Design a protein around this ligand. Structure first.
Ligand SMILES: Cc1cc2nc3c(=O)[nH]c(=O)nc-3n(C[C@H](O)[C@H](O)[C@H](O)COP(=O)(O)O)c2cc1C
Ligand SMILES: Cc1cc2nc3c(=O)[nH]c(=O)nc-3n(C[C@H](O)[C@H](O)[C@H](O)COP(=O)(O)O)c2cc1C
Ligand SMILES: COC(=O)c1ccc2cc(CCc3c(C(=O)O)[nH]c(=O)[nH]c3=O)ccc2c1
Ligand SMILES: COC(=O)c1ccc2cc(CCc3c(C(=O)O)[nH]c(=O)[nH]c3=O)ccc2c1
Lengths: 313, 313
């Protein structure tokens, strides 16, 4: 028994991959993720031009999770495109590429150049809608006319199957509205729920100080704090987007957490904070633990329980 | 060394109170909160007409917190008004009365009848703005026109100092926009941040089932899950509303959690899930733990460190 699956016309040894942001910035990172047992990998979200990011300290982890405000440091799209084009060993696993340009025009310019490599090599695109934080107006995904524009312009410019990375929502009317926008677009084949829970604040009681330097300590929350939130989002989109895959992300520390995501409807399961904390070895443990839970229950396939979460009465 | 505070023309032995909806539904509950060593109490959020609430089960708790979809079960306005006018013992501690009407008109009717008791007995109003409005629209506080509408109408109808209970926000733009709207209304002397994190989803691995019955398991999150969220909101509003008080609510299980909320800017500190789980003896523990932290650090009062979270550079 084993966890292989097939999606978006690619083979995956299992449904586990890193979350965009974590261990995927450098060639070293990417080679390492590739050498791992992950079923797949995603590159750091990129911009046209290299960026240094925000002032350190900008990431911190705690027993219950993480807080970050990295500010989108990355080597520039020319680096990840070249990794996608000449360095990645596709015989090992599929590769997803994340773009998070700061304007629709920035993203349109990137995807046009990515399209041919997608054709030739099979790299897959994840569009980060979560995204920066627009200065007088909210992030793209919390402003649905903006979201509809980006998706229009991008599907025109790329013209292949792609996916989008969503921030969490917290209201039924926004699920309905967001999901309706997404279903306007047939090329969006997958939705990744969720990005970090935006603008938390961790304060350390001993020094009476915030723990990260940018934005007066305010940052995105990962890890055990957001699992119930990530599961609501996965399952809300699972239910509202029947002709799309849902990739779940958020708070996976065990095979159990992974098992819950899948039951909520996840086809792939992404690991962020726990991978940052534990390192790539976590893939062999999560596999094992997930295979153990399946074995105890009599499940031979992920298809047997994907999306089959039970409701009461 | 003491936890005493004077605000809104009332005296409070300590900053601790129950969160609205927890241990405040019945006369039995309210008498219990009053016999506790809480600095104050707040009554369950009421509607005009008594309500049964949603079907059971509807609340559940776990090591890291809770989920609920209670559906506003309460005894009705007349019961809590009568509690405020005839049964409550204001010489023990102050009372807050929470109103969460299902339309602007229902809130207006209640507050008009509350006014004279507010004046004669000194009961204090907390308007729950995290109420649903018309379905298919976001809750009131996520819809800034509805929020504005509700505040002008209740301000005109009530004519007295009241406060407002806010849900969490996750985007700077919303912080700015919600605080700008709040600052239009001089009678809003206080802001409670935050209500439950909306529509999380808790799934039980052994049963493969959601754990609450209403809404396909989707519910409001409290507890350890939401501390950082809650401090972010406390502190955003403490910085954005210099002429109003902030009450903090969110994942307080200890004096250190209360300490943190207070450094973020909290004047009062409410306890929800921890109180539901532990019962009202929790208040003596919280007070001793908080005083223990203050001694160790040299602080003799709360205003010595309220709002005094340090940033880096
Ligand atoms: C240090 C760090 C960097 C991240 N960078 C990105 C990024 O570039 N693009 C992106 O879409 N998400 C990014 N994320 C968000 C993660 O992809 C993930 O959505 C989030 O951490 C929640 O999952 P977790 O609970 O498993 O950590 C980052 C998260 C962290 C902690
Ligand atoms: C069972 C239950 C009932 C609640 N009822 C109300 C309510 O009637 N009105 C309200 O404003 N908030 C209500 N809340 C939210 C709490 O007042 C509080 O804001 C939230 O639980 C966060 O506090 P905690 O993290 O201490 O649980 C309720 C929470 C729970 C768990
Ligand atoms: C005010 O600080 C900024 O300039 C800033 C802050 C956060 C940003 C966040 C992003 C999105 C990339 C990202 C990040 C990140 O790189 O900071 N962290 C996350 O948890 N999720 C993400 O998707 C892009 C630009 C940003 C710029
Ligand atoms: C579940 O669908 C419903 O019919 C319904 C009706 C009224 C509601 C009213 C509220 C607001 C009162 C409230 C509740 C509550 O009573 O459910 N729970 C919270 O955690 N915070 C709250 O502020 C929340 C959900 C509701 C759901």
């Amino acid at each position: 028994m084993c966890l292989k699956l097939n999606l978006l016309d690619h083979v995956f040894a299992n449904p586990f991959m890193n979350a965009a942001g974590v261990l995927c910035s450098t060639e070293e990172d990417l080679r390492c993720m590739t050498a791992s047992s992950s079923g797949a990998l995603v590159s750091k979200s990129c911009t046209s031009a290299p960026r240094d990011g925000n002032p350190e300290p900008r990431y911190m982890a705690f027993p219950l999770g993480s807080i970050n405000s990295m500010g989108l440091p990355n080597l520039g799209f020319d680096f990840y495109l070249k990794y996608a084009s000449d360095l990645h060993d596709y015989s090992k696993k599929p590769l997803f590429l994340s773009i998070s340009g700061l304007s629709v025009e920035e993203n349109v310019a990137m995807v046009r150049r990515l399209a041919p490599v997608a054709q030739e090599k099979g790299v897959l695109l994840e569009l980060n809608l979560s995204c920066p934080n627009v200065p007088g107006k909210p992030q793209v995904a919390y402003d649905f006319e903006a979201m509809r524009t980006y998706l229009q312009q991008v599907s025109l410019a790329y013209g292949l199957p792609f996916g989008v990375k969503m921030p969490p929502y917290f209201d039924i009317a926004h699920f309905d509205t967001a999901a309706a926008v997404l279903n306007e677009f047939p090329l969006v084949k997958f939705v990744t729920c969720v990005n970090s829970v935006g603008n938390g604040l961790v304060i350390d009681a001993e020094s009476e100080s915030v723990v990260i330097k940018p934005k007066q300590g305010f940052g995105g929350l990962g890890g055990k704090y957001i699992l119930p939130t990530a599961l609501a989002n996965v399952n809300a989109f699972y239910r509202r987007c029947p002709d799309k895959l849902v990739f779940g992300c958020g708070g996976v520390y065990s095979g159990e957490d992974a098992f819950l995501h899948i039951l909520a409807g996840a086809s792939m399961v992404q690991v962020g904070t726990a991978l940052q904390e534990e390192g790539p070895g976590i893939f062999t443990r999560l596999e094992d633990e997930l295979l153990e839970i399946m074995a105890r229950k009599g499940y031979r396939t992920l298809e047997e329980f994907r999306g089959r979460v039970k409701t009461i009465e």
